Amino acid sequence: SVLRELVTYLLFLIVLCILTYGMMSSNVYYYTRMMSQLFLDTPVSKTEKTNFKTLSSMEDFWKFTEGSLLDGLYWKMADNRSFIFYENLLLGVPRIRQLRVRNGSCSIPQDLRDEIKECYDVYSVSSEDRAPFGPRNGTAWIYTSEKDLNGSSHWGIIATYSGAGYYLDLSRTREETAAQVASLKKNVWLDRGTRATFIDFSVYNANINLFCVVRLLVEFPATGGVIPSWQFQPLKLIRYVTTFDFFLAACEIIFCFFIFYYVVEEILEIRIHKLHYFRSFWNCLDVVIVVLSVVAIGINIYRTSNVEVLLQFLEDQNTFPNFEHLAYWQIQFNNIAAVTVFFVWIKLFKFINFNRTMSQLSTTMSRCAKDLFGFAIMFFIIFLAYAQLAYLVFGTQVDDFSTFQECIFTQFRIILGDINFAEIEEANRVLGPIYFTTFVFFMFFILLNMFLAIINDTYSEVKSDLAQQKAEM
Amino acid sequence: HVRFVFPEPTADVNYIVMLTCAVCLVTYMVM
Ligand SMILES: *[C@@H]1O[C@H](CO)[C@@H](O)[C@H](O)[C@H]1NC(C)=O
Numbered sequence: 001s002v003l004r005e006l007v008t009y010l011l012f013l014i015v016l017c018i019l020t021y022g023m024m025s026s027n028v029y030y031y032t033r034m035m036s037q038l039f040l041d042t043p044v045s046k047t048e049k050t051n052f053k054t055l056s057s058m059e060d061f062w063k064f065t066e067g068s069l070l071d072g073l074y075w076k077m078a079d080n081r082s083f084i085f086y087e088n089l090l091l092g093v094p095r096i097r098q099l100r101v102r103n104g105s106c107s108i109p110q111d112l113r114d115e116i117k118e119c120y121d122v123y124s125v126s127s128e129d130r131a132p133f134g135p136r137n138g139t140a141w142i143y144t145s146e147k148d149l150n151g152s153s154h155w156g157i158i159a160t161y162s163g164a165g166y167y168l169d170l171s172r173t174r175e176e177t178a179a180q181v182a183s184l185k186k187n188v189w190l191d192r193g194t195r196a197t198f199i200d201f202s203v204y205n206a207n208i209n210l211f212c213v214v215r216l217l218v219e220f221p222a223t224g225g226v227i228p229s230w231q232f233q234p235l236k237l238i239r240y241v242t243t244f245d246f247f248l249a250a251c252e253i254i255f256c257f258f259i260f261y262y263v264v265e266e267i268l269e270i271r272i273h274k275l276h277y278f279r280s281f282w283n284c285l286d287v288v289i290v291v292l293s294v295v296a297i298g299i300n301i302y303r304t305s306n307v308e309v310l311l312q313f314l315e316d317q318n319t320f321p322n323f324e325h326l327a328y329w330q331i332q333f334n335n336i337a338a339v340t341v342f343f344v345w346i347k348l349f350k351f352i353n354f355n356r357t358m359s360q361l362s363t364t365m366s367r368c369a370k371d372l373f374g375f376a377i378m379f380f381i382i383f384l385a386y387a388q389l390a391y392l393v394f395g396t397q398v399d400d401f402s403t404f405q406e407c408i409f410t411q412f413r414i415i416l417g418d419i420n421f422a423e424i425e426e427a428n429r430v431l432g433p434i435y436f437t438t439f440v441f442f443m444f445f446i447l448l449n450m451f452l453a454i455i456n457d458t459y460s461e462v463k464s465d466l467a468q469q470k471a472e473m
Numbered sequence: 474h475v476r477f478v479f480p481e482p483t484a485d486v487n488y489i490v491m492l493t494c495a496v497c498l499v500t501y502m503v504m
Pocket residue numbers: 103104117118
């Protein structure tokens with residue numbers, strides 16, 4: 001019966017909405033914004049206008065380190081801890097790391113080997129330095145493998161950096177950390193071979209039980225310059241503290257039972273009844289929904305089952321708490337759950353056919369999809385043809401066409417009217433205005449109207465057939 | 474011997490091979 005599947009789908013939707021409301025808690029956005037504005041918007045010192053977001057050289061990084069970073073990290077109340085806003089407790093000690101490359105890992109032409117005595121390659125695993133340097137006494141001057149450091153790859157902006165390198169664990173007090181960074185700056189630590197630098201720490205904020213993991217990355221490309229990026233991620237690792245948490249756990253169990261019911265219902269039908277089963281487009285939606293749901297359940301089980309990093313940190317609290325993997329898996333779980341919710345909500349169209357107007361529109365869309373695909377092939381071919389031209393012509397000067405996907409995004413933004421002409425115009429006096437005007441005309445005057453022609457024709461034909469079949473039988 | 478030395482020591486990508494095989498596959502798919 002249709003009523004049974006309708007009511008079970010509504011129950012599934014209700015429990016999904018409850019889960020989404022629970023996971024998206026009270027305003028964590030304000031937590032994140034306060035942390036972000038404290039660490040990213042304050043100028044590096046009282047006389048410069050540069051912050052972390054606008055770093056431009058290697059000396060600016062040193063100004064930021066022994067500067068705004070220590071100002072934000074250490075707040076005055078025997079070796080008392082530090083509360084960042086008098087509320088956020090700094091967990092353990094922060095850590096600083098760098099990834100380097102090797103001298104002589106490059107190829108200097110023989111005719112230039114007289115005014116060029118050193119070439120450093122771009123970052124790659126097969127080219128990173130592993131030898132001691134400088135005052136080779138501590139861990140900041142000695143390579144440590146990824147397994148001895150409990151690290152993982154990062155996928156920054158320029159490349160994907162490994163979890164090894166040269167590291168220091170800082171101190172719990174402002175004075176000792178300041179001395180450590182001054183010593184690092186004196187005996188030069190960042191040189192022309194440096195390729196990346198990481199700063200990592202975490203805070204707790206016991207008021208609302210929610211950890212925050214902060215990572216700041218600075219990339220030094222081989223061609224010179226500085227590229228900063230940041231990441232603030234809130235986590236919940238002590239779930240069961242209040243009654244609402246138990247309610248959420250019960251709802252999660254209900255969700256698992258619903259997923260089991262849906263998969264067993266799927267397999268009971270796919271077995272013998274209708275072996276093809278794929279010419280519906282609703283069965284494909286059901287199978288993708290259950291696949292995403294089981295993937296999310298697996299990720300959640302794999303992630304919450306082990307919190308041994310937290311347990312090990314609770315033994316002694318003078319060490320570095322390593323929470324990067326937990327944040328990575330939290331982000332993955334969030335993405336999967338958001339997509340699953342979107343598709344579950346889309347699945348609602350299967351039941352809105354209660355009169356003669358809903359069925360008309362659904363039939364129109366179904367009969368229009370085929371030739372919409374047929375013309376969308378041409379539309380996308382022309383779109384990519386414009387995108388590659390923009391990439392090849394403006395991709396070295398404009399920063400809005402620097403990468404192919406960025407060209408696609410800029411072309412989509414042009415349709416909305418969010419274009420900045422002040423930089424595209426002088427990138428090429430000819431072929432700059434030509435590209436823009438032809439794109440606008442052939443996108444709004446031509447290709448936007450063929451979709452209308454097709455849709456309008458199929459809708460009118462559907463209505464004509466439905467009105468000629470009816471009132472004539 | 475030895476004659477099969479292990480390839481892939483780095484991560485850079487060569488576009489010539491990918492482009493030519495893509496062309497050679499698309500032409501078959503249309504033919
Ligand atoms: C780098 O290596 C070249 C030769 O490979 C050498 O001449 C140069 O002194 C080296 N520089 C450093 C800083 O090690």
